[PDB]
């Protein structure tokens, strides 16, 4: 197989999402750097690839894709028979059952957690501590619902790790390990169990190792 | 087959997304009301169906699902042979090509446009004109990119209507028809062409009618 091409730095949450997915699916890849600190993602040449001037972007022999969850769904389809076969289900029901919790990442967990990560770690503008308080409360109410769900099932969608869990890793990791908001996860028993299990998965450990080696 | 069951009011954008998809896919359904003006979505029996206390929810003979886009992917999957057969593509590549624009709805267009609709039409608290402007500016930037894309293809993902276009209808229609931010769409000639084209589909007209008879 020819390695697929991924654009962007591993430190980027949306890039990490794709990388963890590739590793779970045993898909070889080649990572092309895009230096966000130098604004390289806004260069006309890159905009030909990702028209919104964001990373990641994905290329293989057949298609160019953007939006990390779309990239991941394609990887899971194309390589269904490979690696972790059950990551995004094995049939129409199991896929949909996982998918609703992927959408919960995208629409519910993702916005407050992502804004927290951005405002605390990746913004050059002074932290509006009111806006922080708003999003912490937002995220706490979400995790209170996760707490009940995770008292019924080991992972969000059922008994096995799925792409719905994987998709929480990038924002979760920055909050737990690079901000003082980790207690939102670790003070909730079932959420803490879940977070501890998913963050210690070998694929995610491999992504963290990639960040370490630049 | 048996009709599927959908929960919530058609005035809800996320419910509207599901309804338009059901109609495109020629799927029979029962719509069960949930009055948001009276807190019905928070009653314990409904929380058993939708753990976030939001609408829509979906049930058929095999599964209960929430999150409108997951509900719609399931419908397109289960009823692929029915109705509009190409709505979410017909193989792995055409599906992924559409899906990236569906994610653009979910992560890029959706948040600022949805926030505008909320702050302008469905919020008790006085509008913060600075936050209004922040989101107008975000959405302008997104639609500048749409304008370029829609000068190359008739719809977002190509020359045929897809779920990616469908998913924009709920927030688009509120902005265009119930706010003074419609110029965002109508001032851009290709976006305006596209908007007119998708919002005049019978499926969308039917959803707007259901609203009236609600
Ligand atoms: S992580 C760096 C930023 N990327 C994204 O936010 C990608 C978001 C998409 N919704 C996705 O693929 O999931 C980024 O590119 N920031 C630079 C910028 O100029 O925005
Ligand atoms: S449209 C009314 C509200 N629902 C949603 O926002 C659903 C969003 C999901 N991400 C989706 O299914 O797409 C709603 O239910 N408001 C009531 C409330 O108490 O929040």
Residue numbers in the entry:
A (entry chain B), B (entry chain A): 2 to 215
The publication says:
Glutathione transferases (GSTs; EC 2.5.1.18) represent a ubiquitous multigenic family of enzymes that conjugate the reduced tripeptide glutathione (GSH, γ-Glu-Cys-Gly) on a wide range of endogenous and exogenous electrophilic molecules. At the structural level, GSTFs exist as homodimers, the dimerization interface involving mainly hydrophobic surface patches. Each monomer comprises an active site region formed by a glutathione binding pocket (G-site) primarily involving residues from the conserved N-terminal thioredoxin domain and an hydrophobic pocket (H-site) primarily involving residues from the less conserved C-terminal domain. A PttGSTF1 monomer consists of an N-terminal domain (β1α1β2α2β3β4α3) and a C-terminal domain composed of α-helices (α4α5α6α6′α7α8) as classically observed in most GST classes.
In order to investigate the biochemical and structural properties of GSTF1, the mature form was expressed in E. coli as well as single mutated protein variants, the catalytic serine of which was replaced by a cysteine or an alanine residue. A mass increment of 305 Da was specifically present in PttGSTF1 S13C, which suggested that a glutathione molecule is covalently bound to the newly introduced cysteine residue via a disulfide bridge. Accordingly, PttGSTF1 S13C is not retained on GSH Sepharose columns contrary to PttGSTF1 and PttGSTF1 S13A. Concerning PttGSTF1 S13C, the structure refinement confirmed that Cys13 is glutathionylated but this modification did not induce significant conformational changes in comparison to PttGSTF1 (RMSD of 0.33Å based on alignments of 350 Cα positions). According to mass spectrometry data, in the PttGSTF1 S13C variant, GSH is covalently bound to the modified residue (Cys13). Apart this difference, the same GSH-protein interactions are observed in both crystal structures. Whereas this suggested that one or several residues other than the serine contribute to the decrease of the pKa of the thiol group of GSH, the PttGSTF1 S13C variant had no or negligible activity toward all these substrates. Concerning PttGSTF1 S13C, whereas no activity has been detected with DHA, a reasonably good catalytic efficiency (1.1 × 103 M−1 s−1) was obtained with HED, essentially because of a good apparent affinity (Km value of 33.7 μM). Another proof of this assumption is that the PttGSTF1 S13C mutant lost its glutathione peroxidase and glutathionylating activity but acquired the capacity to perform deglutathionylation reaction toward HED, an activity typical of Cys-GSTs. Although the detected activity is weaker than the one obtained with naturally-existing Cys-GSTs, it shows that changing the nature of the catalytic residue is sufficient to determine the type of GST activity.
